Motif scaffolding. Sequence first.
Motif, mmCIF file in Angstrom:
data_model
loop_
_atom_site.group_PDB
_atom_site.id
_atom_site.type_symbol
_atom_site.label_atom_id
_atom_site.label_comp_id
_atom_site.label_asym_id
_atom_site.label_seq_id
_atom_site.Cartn_x
_atom_site.Cartn_y
_atom_site.Cartn_z
ATOM 1 N N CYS A 108 -2.172 34.025 5.847
ATOM 2 C CA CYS A 108 -3.037 35.032 5.406
ATOM 3 C C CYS A 108 -4.639 34.173 5.649
ATOM 4 O O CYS A 108 -5.806 35.007 5.781
ATOM 5 C CB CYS A 108 -3.134 35.357 3.940
ATOM 6 N N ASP A 109 -4.618 32.821 5.309
ATOM 7 C CA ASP A 109 -5.963 32.330 5.272
ATOM 8 C C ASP A 109 -6.528 32.034 6.827
ATOM 9 O O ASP A 109 -7.800 32.241 6.971
ATOM 10 C CB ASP A 109 -6.139 31.084 4.430
ATOM 11 N N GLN A 111 -5.771 34.105 9.040
ATOM 12 C CA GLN A 111 -6.222 35.401 9.538
ATOM 13 C C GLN A 111 -7.660 35.877 9.103
ATOM 14 O O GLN A 111 -8.374 36.783 9.606
ATOM 15 C CB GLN A 111 -5.325 36.584 8.987
ATOM 16 N N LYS A 112 -8.229 35.358 8.121
ATOM 17 C CA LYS A 112 -9.424 35.334 7.570
ATOM 18 C C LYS A 112 -10.537 34.517 8.485
ATOM 19 O O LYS A 112 -11.825 34.824 8.386
ATOM 20 C CB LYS A 112 -9.738 34.830 6.074
ATOM 21 N N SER A 143 2.888 34.519 3.296
ATOM 22 C CA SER A 143 1.684 35.204 3.324
ATOM 23 C C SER A 143 1.204 36.148 4.291
ATOM 24 O O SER A 143 0.351 37.041 4.384
ATOM 25 C CB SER A 143 0.460 34.418 3.157
ATOM 26 N N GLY A 144 2.100 36.271 5.444
ATOM 27 C CA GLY A 144 1.897 36.969 6.758
ATOM 28 C C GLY A 144 2.359 36.263 7.923
ATOM 29 O O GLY A 144 3.100 35.303 7.830
#
Length: 194
Positions: A108-109, A111-112, A143-144
């Motif tokens: 998820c991080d 992806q940021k 997280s993804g």
Amino acid sequence: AVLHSEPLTVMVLTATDPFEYESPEHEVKNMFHATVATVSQYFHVKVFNIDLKEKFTKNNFITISNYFESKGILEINETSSVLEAAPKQMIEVPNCITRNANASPKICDIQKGTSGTVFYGVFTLHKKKVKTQNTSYEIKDGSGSIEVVGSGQWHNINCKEGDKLHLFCFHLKRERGQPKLVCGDHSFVKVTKA
């Protein structure tokens, strides 16, 4: 890329096996990845001088000068100096630094991230599709999930669902918003079975 002429003493944490890459002069040469630490921060290091591999052994203290920095990653080449550190230049690396150096980012991080940033980490393989010229590795954590694209020696890597892919120096790119990790000239992958 910025040049650092000031000597910097670090402790070696990890280093990969050497692997082949294409040099700026378009010749097959060998490099390896390393992580090193001061008392207050760890750094990823790309070492383009294969003769330094013995110096980059876990727990060795080394002093580096005339190295470069790009995207927060240190680059050591033939014009750099890497010598063993003197006793009174060595400072104990707190265990907290070494633990942080070993931690992977959450997907998820990743992806940021902004396009062009660089990521390292160990991730579980969910699915893969070997295509005619590249391979897409879908990696996942709690997280993804994100697509990792490998070409060249990172195409058709011998791996299966549930194996862990250790990714070194992969590049974040965005196609229609959708982020993915793509390999670059100095990427490296190792596989641990599971």
